[PDB]
Amino acid sequence: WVTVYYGVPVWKEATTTLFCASDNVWATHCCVPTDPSPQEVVLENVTENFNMWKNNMVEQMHEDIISLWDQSLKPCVKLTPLCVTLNCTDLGEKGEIKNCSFNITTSVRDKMQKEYATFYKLDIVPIDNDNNSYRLINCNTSVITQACPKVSFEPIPIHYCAPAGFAILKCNNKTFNGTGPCTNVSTVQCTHGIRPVVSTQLLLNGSLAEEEIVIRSENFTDNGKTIIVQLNESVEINCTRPNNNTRKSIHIGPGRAFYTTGQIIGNIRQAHCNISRAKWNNTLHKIVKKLREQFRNKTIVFKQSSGGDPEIVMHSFNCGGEFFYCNSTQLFNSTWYGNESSNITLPCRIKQIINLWQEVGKAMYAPPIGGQIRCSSNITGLLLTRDGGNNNITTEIFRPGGGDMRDNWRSELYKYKVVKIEPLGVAPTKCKRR
Amino acid sequence: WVTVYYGVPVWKEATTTLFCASDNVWATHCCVPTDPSPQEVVLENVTENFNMWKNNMVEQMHEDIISLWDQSLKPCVKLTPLCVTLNCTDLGEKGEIKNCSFNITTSVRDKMQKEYATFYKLDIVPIDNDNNSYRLINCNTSVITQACPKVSFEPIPIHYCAPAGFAILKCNNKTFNGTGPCTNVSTVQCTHGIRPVVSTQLLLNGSLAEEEIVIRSENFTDNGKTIIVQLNESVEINCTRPNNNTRKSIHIGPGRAFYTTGQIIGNIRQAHCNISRAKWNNTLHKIVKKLREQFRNKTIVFKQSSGGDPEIVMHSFNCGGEFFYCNSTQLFNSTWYGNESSNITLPCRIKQIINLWQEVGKAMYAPPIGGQIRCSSNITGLLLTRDGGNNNITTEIFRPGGGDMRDNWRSELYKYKVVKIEPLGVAPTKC
Amino acid sequence: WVTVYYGVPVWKEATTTLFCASDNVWATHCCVPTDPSPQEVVLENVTENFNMWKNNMVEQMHEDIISLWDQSLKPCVKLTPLCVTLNCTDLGEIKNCSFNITTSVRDKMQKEYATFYKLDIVPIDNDNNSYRLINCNTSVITQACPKVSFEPIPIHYCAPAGFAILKCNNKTFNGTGPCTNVSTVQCTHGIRPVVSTQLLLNGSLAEEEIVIRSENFTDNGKTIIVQLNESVEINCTRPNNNTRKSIHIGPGRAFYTTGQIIGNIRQAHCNISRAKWNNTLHKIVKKLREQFRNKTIVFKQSSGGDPEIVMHSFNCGGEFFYCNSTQLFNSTWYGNITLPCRIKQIINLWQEVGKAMYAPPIGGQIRCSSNITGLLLTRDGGNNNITTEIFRPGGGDMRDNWRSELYKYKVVKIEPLGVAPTKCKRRV
Amino acid sequence: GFLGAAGSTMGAASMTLTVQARQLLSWGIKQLQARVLAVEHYLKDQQLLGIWGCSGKLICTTAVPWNATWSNKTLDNIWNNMTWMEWEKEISNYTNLIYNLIEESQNQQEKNETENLTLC
Amino acid sequence: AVGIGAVFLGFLGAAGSTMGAASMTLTVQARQLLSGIVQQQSNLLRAPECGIKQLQARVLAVEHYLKDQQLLGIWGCSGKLICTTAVPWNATWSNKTLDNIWNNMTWMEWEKEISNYTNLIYNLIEESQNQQEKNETENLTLC
Amino acid sequence: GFLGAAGSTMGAASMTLTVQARQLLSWGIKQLQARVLAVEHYLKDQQLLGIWGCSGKLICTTAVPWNATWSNKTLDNIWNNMTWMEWEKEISNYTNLIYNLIEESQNQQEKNETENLTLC
Amino acid sequence: XXXXXXXXXXXXXXXXXXXXXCXXXXXXXXXXXXXXXXXXXXXXXXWXXXXXXXXXXXXXXXXXXXXXXXXXXXXXXXXXXXXXXXXXXXXXXXXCXXXXXXXXXXXXXXXXXXXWXXXXXXXX
Amino acid sequence: XXXXXXXXXXXXXXXXXXXXXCXXXXXXXXXXXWXXXXXXXXXXXXXXXXXXXXXXXXXXXXXXXXXXXXXXXXXXXXXXXXXXXXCXXXXXXXXXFXXXXXXXX
Numbered sequence A: 001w002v003t004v005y006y007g008v009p010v011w012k013e014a015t016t017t018l019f020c021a022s023d024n025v026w027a028t029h030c031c032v033p034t035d036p037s038p039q040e041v042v043l044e045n046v047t048e049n050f051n052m053w054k055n056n057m058v059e060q061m062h063e064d065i066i067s068l069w070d071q072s073l074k075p076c077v078k079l080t081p082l083c084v085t086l087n088c089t090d091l092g093e094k095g096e097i098k099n100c101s102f103n104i105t106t107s108v109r110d111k112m113q114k115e116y117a118t119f120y121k122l123d124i125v126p127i128d129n130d131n132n133s134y135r136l137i138n139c140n141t142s143v144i145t146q147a148c149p150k151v152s153f154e155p156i157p158i159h160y161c162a163p164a165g166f167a168i169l170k171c172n173n174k175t176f177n178g179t180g181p182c183t184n185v186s187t188v189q190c191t192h193g194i195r196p197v198v199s200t201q202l203l204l205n206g207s208l209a210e211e212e213i214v215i216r217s218e219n220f221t222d223n224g225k226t227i228i229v230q231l232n233e234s235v236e237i238n239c240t241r242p243n244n245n246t247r248k249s250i251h252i253g254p255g256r257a258f259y260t261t262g263q264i265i266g267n268i269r270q271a272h273c274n275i276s277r278a279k280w281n282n283t284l285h286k287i288v289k290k291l292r293e294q295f296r297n298k299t300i301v302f303k304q305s306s307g308g309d310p311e312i313v314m315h316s317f318n319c320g321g322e323f324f325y326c327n328s329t330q331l332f333n334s335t336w337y338g339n340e341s342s343n344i345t346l347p348c349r350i351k352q353i354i355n356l357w358q359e360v361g362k363a364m365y366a367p368p369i370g371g372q373i374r375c376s377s378n379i380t381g382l383l384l385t386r387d388g389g390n391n392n393i394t395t396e397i398f399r400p401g402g403g404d405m406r407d408n409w410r411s412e413l414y415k416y417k418v419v420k421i422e423p424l425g426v427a428p429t430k431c432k433r434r
Numbered sequence B: 001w002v003t004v005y006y007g008v009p010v011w012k013e014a015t016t017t018l019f020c021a022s023d024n025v026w027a028t029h030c031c032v033p034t035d036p037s038p039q040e041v042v043l044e045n046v047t048e049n050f051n052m053w054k055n056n057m058v059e060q061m062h063e064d065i066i067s068l069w070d071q072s073l074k075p076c077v078k079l080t081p082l083c084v085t086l087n088c089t090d091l092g093e094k095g096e097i098k099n100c101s102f103n104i105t106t107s108v109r110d111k112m113q114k115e116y117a118t119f120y121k122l123d124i125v126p127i128d129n130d131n132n133s134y135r136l137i138n139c140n141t142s143v144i145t146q147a148c149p150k151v152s153f154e155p156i157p158i159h160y161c162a163p164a165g166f167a168i169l170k171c172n173n174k175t176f177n178g179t180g181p182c183t184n185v186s187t188v189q190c191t192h193g194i195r196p197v198v199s200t201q202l203l204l205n206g207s208l209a210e211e212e213i214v215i216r217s218e219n220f221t222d223n224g225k226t227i228i229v230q231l232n233e234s235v236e237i238n239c240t241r242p243n244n245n246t247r248k249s250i251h252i253g254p255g256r257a258f259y260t261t262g263q264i265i266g267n268i269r270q271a272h273c274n275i276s277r278a279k280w281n282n283t284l285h286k287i288v289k290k291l292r293e294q295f296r297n298k299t300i301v302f303k304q305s306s307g308g309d310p311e312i313v314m315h316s317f318n319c320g321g322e323f324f325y326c327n328s329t330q331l332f333n334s335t336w337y338g339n340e341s342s343n344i345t346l347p348c349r350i351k352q353i354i355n356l357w358q359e360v361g362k363a364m365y366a367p368p369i370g371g372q373i374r375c376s377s378n379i380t381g382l383l384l385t386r387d388g389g390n391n392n393i394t395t396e397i398f399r400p401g402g403g404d405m406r407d408n409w410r411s412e413l414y415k416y417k418v419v420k421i422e423p424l425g426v427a428p429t430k431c
Numbered sequence C: 001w002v003t004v005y006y007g008v009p010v011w012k013e014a015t016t017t018l019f020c021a022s023d024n025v026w027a028t029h030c031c032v033p034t035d036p037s038p039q040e041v042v043l044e045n046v047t048e049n050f051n052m053w054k055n056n057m058v059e060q061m062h063e064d065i066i067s068l069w070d071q072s073l074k075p076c077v078k079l080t081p082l083c084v085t086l087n088c089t090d091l092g093e094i095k096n097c098s099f100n101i102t103t104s105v106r107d108k109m110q111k112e113y114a115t116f117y118k119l120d121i122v123p124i125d126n127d128n129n130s131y132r133l134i135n136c137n138t139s140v141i142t143q144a145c146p147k148v149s150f151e152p153i154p155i156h157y158c159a160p161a162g163f164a165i166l167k168c169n170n171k172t173f174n175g176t177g178p179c180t181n182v183s184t185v186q187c188t189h190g191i192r193p194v195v196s197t198q199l200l201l202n203g204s205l206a207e208e209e210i211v212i213r214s215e216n217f218t219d220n221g222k223t224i225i226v227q228l229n230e231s232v233e234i235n236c237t238r239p240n241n242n243t244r245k246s247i248h249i250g251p252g253r254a255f256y257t258t259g260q261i262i263g264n265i266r267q268a269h270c271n272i273s274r275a276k277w278n279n280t281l282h283k284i285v286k287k288l289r290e291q292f293r294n295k296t297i298v299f300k301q302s303s304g305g306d307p308e309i310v311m312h313s314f315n316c317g318g319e320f321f322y323c324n325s326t327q328l329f330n331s332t333w334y335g336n337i338t339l340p341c342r343i344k345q346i347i348n349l350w351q352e353v354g355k356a357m358y359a360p361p362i363g364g365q366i367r368c369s370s371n372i373t374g375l376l377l378t379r380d381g382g383n384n385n386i387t388t389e390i391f392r393p394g395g396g397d398m399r400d401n402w403r404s405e406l407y408k409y410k411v412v413k414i415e416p417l418g419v420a421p422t423k424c425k426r427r428v
Numbered sequence D, F: 001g002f003l004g005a006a007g008s009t010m011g012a013a014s015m016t017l018t019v020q021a022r023q024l025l026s027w028g029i030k031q032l033q034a035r036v037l038a039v040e041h042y043l044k045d046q047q048l049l050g051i052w053g054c055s056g057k058l059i060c061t062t063a064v065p066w067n068a069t070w071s072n073k074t075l076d077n078i079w080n081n082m083t084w085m086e087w088e089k090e091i092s093n094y095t096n097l098i099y100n101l102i103e104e105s106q107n108q109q110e111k112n113e114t115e116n117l118t119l120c
Numbered sequence E: 001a002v003g004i005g006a007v008f009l010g011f012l013g014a015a016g017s018t019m020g021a022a023s024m025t026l027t028v029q030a031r032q033l034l035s036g037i038v039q040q041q042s043n044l045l046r047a048p049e050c051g052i053k054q055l056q057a058r059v060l061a062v063e064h065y066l067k068d069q070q071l072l073g074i075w076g077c078s079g080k081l082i083c084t085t086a087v088p089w090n091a092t093w094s095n096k097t098l099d100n101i102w103n104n105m106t107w108m109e110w111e112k113e114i115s116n117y118t119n120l121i122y123n124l125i126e127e128s129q130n131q132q133e134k135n136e137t138e139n140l141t142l143c
Numbered sequence G: 001x002x003x004x005x006x007x008x009x010x011x012x013x014x015x016x017x018x019x020x021x022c023x024x025x026x027x028x029x030x031x032x033x034x035x036x037x038x039x040x041x042x043x044x045x046x047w048x049x050x051x052x053x054x055x056x057x058x059x060x061x062x063x064x065x066x067x068x069x070x071x072x073x074x075x076x077x078x079x080x081x082x083x084x085x086x087x088x089x090x091x092x093x094x095x096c097x098x099x100x101x102x103x104x105x106x107x108x109x110x111x112x113x114x115x116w117x118x119x120x121x122x123x124x
Numbered sequence H: 001x002x003x004x005x006x007x008x009x010x011x012x013x014x015x016x017x018x019x020x021x022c023x024x025x026x027x028x029x030x031x032x033x034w035x036x037x038x039x040x041x042x043x044x045x046x047x048x049x050x051x052x053x054x055x056x057x058x059x060x061x062x063x064x065x066x067x068x069x070x071x072x073x074x075x076x077x078x079x080x081x082x083x084x085x086x087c088x089x090x091x092x093x094x095x096x097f098x099x100x101x102x103x104x105x
């Protein structure tokens, strides 16, 4: 009369805790081995509504990244004893790197030892007006923790996996705009491999579009929303720190060693980064061609972002353990009209005291790496912001940079949603109970 | 023939972990919502033995309270750089509040900064023979942790609830003396709302007796036991901290600030509590009548607790966010006979360094609250201790204050016991 | 016809997490009550393959002991204010060291005195008076809490439901291979987590004679575990009537040291019964010759006076003894004893990097009443052609102090679901 | 495959009830709660199936009439022209009413099984 | 209003009633216990914002449910509130008139009366089911 | 005794299935994981028995004649002259695929109960 | 003997919730069913609701089941009743009463009003 | 079920053996209770169950029969009979009351 069916293939939207599979900090945290050849069950006749900007998988990824970084830094050397006056001189540009001396108590707590350390200008703030007395940029208002040299934060592919009772639905529409119905949807246990790459303007080592550049925005006419551009072909970006550094340790406690550059061999050089000019020009041409679909009959103008701290206006990234802040102005300085047809060297600065999550009263010190650093990354997407208050004219201005760190992960999680399985269904059959 | 019955209305005494529900430390911990119109079932013809002095719900409440107090102080500022010599001058009786200066190293390790802070006399102990040289009390033998200004410890009603498979039995005898059989028993899943109020002599904001004053003791003959007096009517106690304080923040580290009082506006005035004289006089008369029933044909004399330690000879409480230590001598200084017929302002001291749970090597610093503090609490019970050795006289001596902290909560949990449900059983049948 | 059976008494060898029961660091950890006398089912007509050398119960015991020790020392005093120059005067095995230490009050420094052993004092200058606390240069020395006992007590390792512990009851079992007398228990016996390096004190005795087990007996570099059926009584005496005092270095955090030694200062010695030890070595060589036939057995030691490599290290309840093994293993066998020992207060039992523990002294005088129940010996390689077999004390690591007791146990996973043929139809 | 029948008709999906039923059963506290929660969800459904006289069955026919205020499409379309997702959405507002009647029906059956037929 | 079985007394309401009358409220007790997880999940949905103590309480509640269900599953009692077996009652377990047991005793008094024999009785019940299980396949006329 | 029949023949050992069944269910993360794992194994086996038409049984004959291979011994050689440990070794292979046959057979039978087998 | 007495709001608005209360006296609340019924002007009494006091085992007339509630406070020994969106047509003299619970050793039961309170006139 | 007053009125000048019946749509078994709904008062119980005299009931108040044909009568309605003869089916059919007969005398 009324028949109960258990094992009904239905689900409802739900938020749960996801676990993480891999295959240092990521390998340790995402300790679950992955399953080769995931079942990837195709749903032959379903339509599922997605919304990449309300996806709680991004919120969980963000919280997991912050928690993992915090746990990784807890069992490490604190730099509180170094919040002292620094007597700094210049090396060699012409003042970018300083050789600073100070009086610090050593591991045996009865001897004051004069020590020398090498600091970058961005990490040093003047104290006095003599141009010699400096202090660490925020040591009086925050606790600076040295990253453990044995703990690697290098991004690796990770997979977010649903617990039993839940499933992840993946949109397999190659041109899906991140919101609305997807009519070609499959069910997976885990997401694809996602690299937790931290950057502020360009998306590095991400996924490429299958057929075309896809430009996504929560509301394209709302100037306050970040535009995420997913490229269909990567652009190679080759960043380097050519200075050959010899590292030394300064001991500041019973087993608490401060790491600094001991000496620089050869000449001091700028940590430039090279992007191919032809590939970037074609990339911008194709971005303009797709962007003009949302902004009809407008000139597309690329400009650098409004002035501010390097974390806001420069391209920030982790290259081999060093944090580079590159001047991207040469990449976003052009006017395109739509009637066109078809090396860039970016200077960069190195900053050792990093506050990646904008925490109050906390900062990380990245110890120097000796030798030279070279990275080759793939630019797979862009974060653009459209100027506000810009109307009544025939041109649009786009600037690099998005919102917070979530924008770097939505670009990978845009095709996934987590659903809860509801196996109990009821149908009005006519069978009697007995 | 053996017949198996499942759903048998049988239970056994058991100890389990109860969860906390509520309708701030307590709002955060007791996150589970309560049920509307909670289910209570009266058990007819059921006699159940209760013993309020062997009730594991009290032990759990005690451990949970201590655990939350310990957890809430974990991320807060530890006041270790302040255990230094203080140059303290009188601020005003004039010496109750002192203006103390000290040389403290600030967040910059090579720069010494002279700072000023305001401390109460009870928190400052002289160290040298210089009348102006003092140090913080117990800072050399304990770690003083500042309470976080954003964390409120104000007690709210909470309910202790049994997990499924267990039930809480309640005694509905309005004059039950806390031990022995109870013949009016009901089963509930959650206790009534209990406020985790901390005090040393008077029980504040508690439950009132349904019918008359009920006096309970594990053994009345044994004078070493605490006597818990549950009142018929509450007595209102209105406590004031009249000083208008301005909070000041002293930075003692890289993101660690110490909070003190920078200035006081107006005159320095004594904190005090106002208890109605007629209501207290009636309360003591009624208590004496019940004590005479327990202690037949004897004179009942109330005296203040002996000793000089403000923690045990004064009425202390946390109200308004500050800890008051009030001199209750005016309340417990009387002689009553059997032929008796049918404002009191208590001076109070403020103490900022509180060893609230009698910990070894630990203390909390209560930061000052600016403005003035007003408090209105209900006195719903008393803890009395009887003097021993008076076996050759006709007068009994009672003093305020009990022998334990748990006694403040037994007075609320005395009517509840936790039992485990045993739904399965067997019996012979006519098969 | 296929019939499914549930509750089948079969199992596979498996590694799972074991929990712990006990009747102190082990107290409040091994929180489960023990069996009301052993609950054991003897399994008749069964054979079970055992392997004491690949038994993950030993590895779990190792990890559990390290974790317990690491947790036990966290809420204790960290001796970082003491890594200062010491002015030490000989009493020169034990020195009276004075130092200027800042106390709990940040504005005041006191000149304190403490008693340190030579093994815990590092010379730092050429004046023969300036010394520093050992390893404080690079490690954090944590004082053991004086209220927490590290005495080894019997504990029982228990399997979770769905798993069972099988025990081999073959009194002469070689440690590996098929066992023909097997029983089922839920918990192991009262194993003593004794920390030692050669002597295996306060262990279990062999049921019969002396049983000598090894993973191979022909490979070089492997431990030989000798289990005795008779105990050898040892009374290790530290006849120094110490009076202990505390030094307050932080806000209720104090360092505990010996304040004075009353009477004479004498080297600690282990009084080992001569007849029992001589008979023990005699019986050991008599059984050892069954495995190393037609050979002379001698004891020729390893290397010199390295407390953590060559000397016999063992605990007594806070006073760690480092004994000179050459007193006991120097004989030639064919056809009282007073063992000198040193005391070391700064130890690193599991060779951790950046950490060390300070063991507070025990006041009064002490006697370490203990039994030799077995030995960990290593054979000297390359002597197969000289007619004399050379053995030495030591070798291996801490795992061999537990393998000698857990050799008779294995953990198995129960597989209650079986399939078997029947005569019945489903009758759908 | 798991949920492979999700886009199929209600009739066809009845042959995949065992595919989902097995899949549903399978740092630190963060993940330990998930395992406990998964068990509770499994048991939640089993308890509901235990309350209803549906224990041990994938398809359980009840004794509750369907002639109420419930939205009920012709069976030809429910089983051959509808999937379970749209079906469950169609009757979503009546889910609790349906469940309550099923429990009530079982309680009457229990009275017959436990209170009336007092045989042995 | 008129009927048999004091369901309206609520959970444990019949605890003070005699064994016979209280047998009409087994459903009341069972519903309170056999819905503990369903009800707990419903209570959890009222405050989604809601470590060791909570997991121990939840695991214990699950273990108690599963142990009762396993024990009834081992006995031939699955799905039944009242279950009878093939085990005769021993005169040593309790020597009383059956009418007085059912009409002059409550279940509390009864369970106290036979407490020392409860585990013994349970073991006998299990033994009888094993014999029945063999009878289901040993007697091939049922197959 | 618990597992005392392991060295006994399969026939005799079939009488202690409840002895083992009772014993299959019977830094705080370590103890909780041990308890959760024991619960998960119990439920895993109970679900497998209940997806098959074996719920509530200790001995369950299913709708499966023996297929090619699967067993190399007859009824007397297995039940009277062999132990369960020896049996597990004898059929250490052929431990899968049959489970899907049984699962599908049970689902087909439950569907048939509402379509054409001993119907309604 | 039982001396129940009713009290109620002086007046209610039309199409608004209404409530009333009844105090028990000289009787156990438990082992009896608290009840309320009301008589419209120039009409026979109609039963409205009842609840077993021992466990709040409420029951109500089907006509009012969708817009009625009943509760009691054992601590106060008092019953209460309410109805949602009370219509003007609901005006009546509403009385509370105790219906004895005629429990037998056989677990039989019956209930009917026995002890009546004076009515509380009410209108919406 | 439902209850109804079969007699619209049961009035007499004095001392009549007045009677009324309580009819029903279905049997009320032993629950056909009676009450005296006196003017300006809550109704008094007249008889419990089908014929169990109410506590302190008058000796002259008779009750008889049951269920769908229950009845009650005065031995003699000597005084104060002007009360409606209410009855109820206090059984499965909730606690439905009859219209009540307009008794008088």
Ligand SMILES: *[C@@H]1O[C@H](CO)[C@@H](O[C@@H]2O[C@H](CO)[C@@H](O[C@@H]3O[C@H](CO)[C@@H](O)[C@H](O)[C@@H]3O)[C@H](O)[C@H]2NC(C)=O)[C@H](O)[C@H]1NC(C)=O
Residues within 6 Å of the ligand: B044, B045, E013, E014, E016, E017, E018, G103, G104, G105, G106
């Ligand atoms: C709790 O205990 C009381 C007292 O034992 C129980 O009440 C008693 O119930 C019996 C029925 O089992 C009553 O007997 C009946 O009395 C009437 C009186 O007119 C008589 O006509 C019947 O034939 C029968 O004898 C007894 O009077 C009654 N006693 C009292 C004092 O009320 C009560 O039922 C028990 N409660 C539970 C929940 O078991």
Ligand SMILES: *[C@@H]1O[C@H](CO)[C@@H](O[C@@H]2O[C@H](CO)[C@@H](O)[C@H](O)[C@H]2NC(C)=O)[C@H](O)[C@H]1NC(C)=O
Residues within 6 Å of the ligand: A040, A042, A043, A044, A172, A183, A184, A185, A186
């Ligand atoms: C959506 O349609 C595409 C084809 O346009 C399907 O793509 C195939 O997906 C399978 C997945 O196993 C691959 O093996 C094939 O190689 C893909 N084919 C091509 C031509 O690329 C896709 O699976 C469909 N997805 C859904 C959910 O219906």
Ligand SMILES: *[C@@H]1O[C@H](CO)[C@@H](O)[C@H](O)[C@H]1NC(C)=O
Residues within 6 Å of the ligand: A211, A212, A213, A232, A233, A286, A287, A290
């Ligand atoms: C996509 O990639 C192909 C690669 O050949 C390229 O030709 C095409 O222009 C790209 N599309 C866009 C929109 O950039």
Ligand SMILES: *[C@@H]1O[C@H](CO)[C@@H](O)[C@H](O)[C@H]1NC(C)=O
Residues within 6 Å of the ligand: A236, A237, A238, A274, A275, A276, A343, A376
């Ligand atoms: C970056 O390096 C790769 C080889 O690692 C090379 O293919 C690519 O052309 C380089 N990019 C630029 C912009 O020079």
Ligand SMILES: *[C@@H]1O[C@H](CO)[C@@H](O)[C@H](O)[C@H]1NC(C)=O
Residues within 6 Å of the ligand: B125, B127, B135, B136, B137, B138, B139, B140, B141
């Ligand atoms: C310091 O400690 C001693 C005991 O060692 C105590 O007597 C003294 O009062 C303490 N000082 C302060 C300021 O509390």
Ligand SMILES: *[C@@H]1O[C@H](CO)[C@@H](O)[C@H](O)[C@H]1NC(C)=O
Residues within 6 Å of the ligand: B236, B237, B238, B274, B275, B276, B277, B343, B376
């Ligand atoms: C305390 O304050 C309350 C506030 O309402 C007032 O009623 C009471 O009389 C006051 N009592 C005293 C003793 O001041």
Ligand SMILES: *[C@@H]1O[C@H](CO)[C@@H](O)[C@H](O)[C@H]1NC(C)=O
Residues within 6 Å of the ligand: A044, A045, D004, D005, D007, D008, D009, D012
């Ligand atoms: C999807 O729909 C088509 C008809 O449009 C049908 O043939 C096919 O079987 C459906 N898919 C599934 C998985 O049943």
